[PDB]
Each structure stands twice: as structure tokens, then as C-alpha cells.
Design a protein that fits this description.
Chains C, D: One of its GO terms (cellular component) is extracellular region. Chains C, D: Its main location: secreted. Chains C, D: Homotetramer. Four copies of one chain form a homotetramer. By secondary structure, chain A is an all-beta fold. Chain A has one domain (1-120): Lipocalin. In chain A, 0% of the residues lie in helices and 55% in strands. Chain A contains no helices and eight strands. Chain A has an eight-stranded antiparallel beta sheet with strand order 1-2-3-4-5-6-7-8, with no helix packed on it. The interface between A and B is large, with 53 and 54 residues. The structure holds 2-iminobiotin. 2-iminobiotin is lined by residues 8, 10, 12, 30, 32-35, 64, 71, 73, 75, 93, 95, 111, 113 of chain A. 2-iminobiotin binds next to strand 6, strand 7 and strand 8 of chain A.
Chain lengths: 120, 114, 111, 111
């Protein structure tokens, strides 16, 4: 279900493997910002969701440092997986950059990403 | 300065180990209230007195309990004698499509070594 | 371009009046009053027009002890829309304040 | 209660008037107009009073092409406070929309 290759509305590709113990591992490649190539993704999911047709809660993080670039920032996505003919993951994200004390009021961006198993 | 025990303003206790290549692993917490954490951090931060960007996730499921939800914390570690982690968090619960609009809470937490 | 009737994704109807001094007044449809501000002198370079508004969910008939604020921008053009993120806060006791605030997003269109 | 002069943790000054059926009006300060709403009939059980307001960062001297909304609750008591979370959106292009909005939190007191 969650395991597979996902794309957000921006071209980004996230390759995610769901483990049997609630672990989420994989790789992100962003189509925007200060990023190049692949970045390590790690997260957790609810490995035994409700019966009742509710979604599957999950979250993951990417720190935007790899061997090519370092953006001194990290993003966390929080959302739910919803099965169906068109499986989708709906998330909200927080992106925090490292700042000095004086600039911390403006260190965090917030947005929403919708992931699909079909590239837009 | 990150590896160790951190406490938030709620009493809760977080034990985190920060690996050499940017992994964060540990637990949030008796057994029944203990949960797994996994995250990532900037292992090569700037020198300019900037904070170290990081983030982590906890799904609220263990062997004993399952709240069908996950929290992510996004934030930065600040050093010194008043070492702190300042974060904002998102908590999402699994919902039906009908109730998705109220699936996510937002808030902030501050973690201290004491 | 902002003044008029707007519809978000779950059919709610917002009637918005943009005043020349930057004020936004109108109603969200039971029916509640809205009030906000917008940039009454945006850039002409394709940038959007920044805005925000608030609805407290109390009227003559019902009270939910909560308020929502929408923060976003207007984008004009053939398919004008207002893209927003929102925060919904409910009155809670001090000990439930951690769970007093929801976050989401809303898109408004003219049809 | 809510009417008065409020200061946030960074020292900015908000002068707020609470109107009879839930209007918030006032200024933030370099001085800008604020507008919002609040629950004029809060719960008696000890809960806080839900509210929100907006400031568009345009006045007669400067315009940053951006707007902030605060969502939160007023807590009466020893330290009357207003605990909020805020969103600041800047007018951007289509291409830069994904990075248009910052989020944070603010505590206000009369001290
Ligand atoms: N796929 C996505 N890319 C952007 C959003 C949220 S994370 C962001 C990319 C940031 C890359 C590093 C940076 O620019 O600081 N979703």
C-alpha cells in the first residue's frame, strides 16, 4: 500500500518502503528549493489502522543535506494514507531552516503536499 | 550536544541518539507509555551561530496501545549552557474522508536538558 | 477582483467586500460575520495579493466557542482563486490548550 | 478584559478594542491597522475566549506585500494572556507559492 514510488503535485519523487514494525524508510528528490539528487527519508506509520475506513496516520522527515549540497534545513510531513482506486497521501508539512536567535521568528515554513502513485 | 535525554514542557521524556550521518533515533515516554522515535538532523551546520535544523516522528502505537495517530516535530537545536530544542509540531489522526478537515492539530514544544 | 462570492472546496459560501482602504468585510455561509485585511496596492509582476480574514463561530443562534483565521493570497486571471492555509482555535481549559488548534488549507474559486 | 494594550515577547505593541458583538479593532506597532473577531459569549466552565485578527503590512509609508493572521485564545486570571499561533503569507508568483507562508506562535500580556 504505502510502499512504492510517490509523486507530489510539484514533480517531486519519494521512494518509500514501509517496514513490518511501523518504520518508514526511503528517499526524496525535490523539484524545488536548494536541493540536488536524493536525500534520506525516515519516518513512522500506524501499522495497525482502524477497521472503520479511517485513514492510516504517518509522518516522515528529510534533512536537506547530502554529498552534493547542504541547505541547513529539514522538513517534516505529517498526514494520512487513504486506500482506494486512487491511493493518495495527504499531508501538511513544516520546513525549518537553522537561523540565529534574532531570525528564529521566521525560520519555519508551512504548506501542504498531496502524494499520488501517478506522476503529474 | 543533541544526543541525550530531553524534557518538554509537559513532563514527557525524550531519549535521542544522533548518529554520525544525520540519523536521530530514540524513544518518547512505564512500558505502556514508551514509543519509538525516528528522525534526521543537519550533521554539518553553519558556523555563524545558526541553530541545527532537525526533525523527528513518533506514531502513537506500541505493543500495548494504538491511538491511530502520528506526531512530527520540526525545529532546531540551540547550544550553550541553555541548550534547547525549539520546535513546532503537527499531530495527525487517521480519519474518514468526511472528517479529514479536522485531522491535524498544530502546536509548539520546547525541550530542555533539565 | 476580490469583491464578490467565493466557494471553497466543501461548498461553503463566502461573500467578500474589498474596501479601498484595505478592509475585507462580508459573511461566511448558518451565517457568520467575516472581517479581514488585504494588500490594497499589490505588485504588478504576477505576484499574488496577500490577505487574511477571521470568522468567530457565533451568531444570534449558535456559538461554537471558536474562531478560524485564513491566511493566503488572491490570484487573478481566467481562473481566479484564493489559496489559503487556516488555523481553527477553540476555547479550552489551560490543560487542553495543547489540543486547541487545528491547521488546514482551503481553496476558493469564483464558480 | 481583551480591550487594552498588549505586548508580545518581541516587544511589539498591540492596541485592541473589543466591541459588543465580537468585533476586534486596533493597531499594531511603523503603525498598522488590525481587524478581527472574538467569541463574545464564552463558556463558563473555565475555558479561554477564542479569537483571531489580521494585519496587512501596508500603511501610508510602507508596503511589504504580506499579511499575518493570529488565531488563539484570551486567558483571564493572574496573568491575563493571549496565546496565539500565526501565519504570515507573502504575495508570491505561482512558482514560489509553496514557500509563501511562515508559521509561528506569540504570547501577549499587558505587561
Ligand atoms: N517536495 C517538496 N519540496 C518542497 C516542499 C516542502 S520541502 C521543499 C523543498 C526544500 C528543499 C531544501 C530547501 O530548499 O531548503 N515539498
Amino acid at each position: 500500500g504505502i510502499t512504492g514510488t510517490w509523486y507530489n503535485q510539484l514533480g517531486s519523487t519519494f521512494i518509500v518502503t514501509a517496514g513490518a514494525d511501523g518504520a518508514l524508510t526511503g528517499t526524496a528528490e525535490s523539484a524545488v528549493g536548494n536541493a540536488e539528487s536524493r536525500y534520506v527519508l525516515t519516518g513512522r506509520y500506524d501499522s495497525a489502522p482502524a477497521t472503520d475506513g479511517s485513514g492510516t496516520a504517518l509522518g516522515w522527515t528529510v534533512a536537506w543535506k547530502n554529498n552534493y549540497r547542504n541547505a541547513h534545513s529539514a522538513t517534516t510531513w505529517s498526514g494520512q494514507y487513504v486506500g482506494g482506486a486512487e491511493a493518495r497521501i495527504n499531508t501538511q508539512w513544516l520546513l525549518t531552516s537553522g537561523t540565529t536567535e534574532a531570525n528564529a521568528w521566521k525560520s519555519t515554513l508551512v504548506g501542504h503536499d498531496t502524494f499520488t502513485k501517478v506522476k503529474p
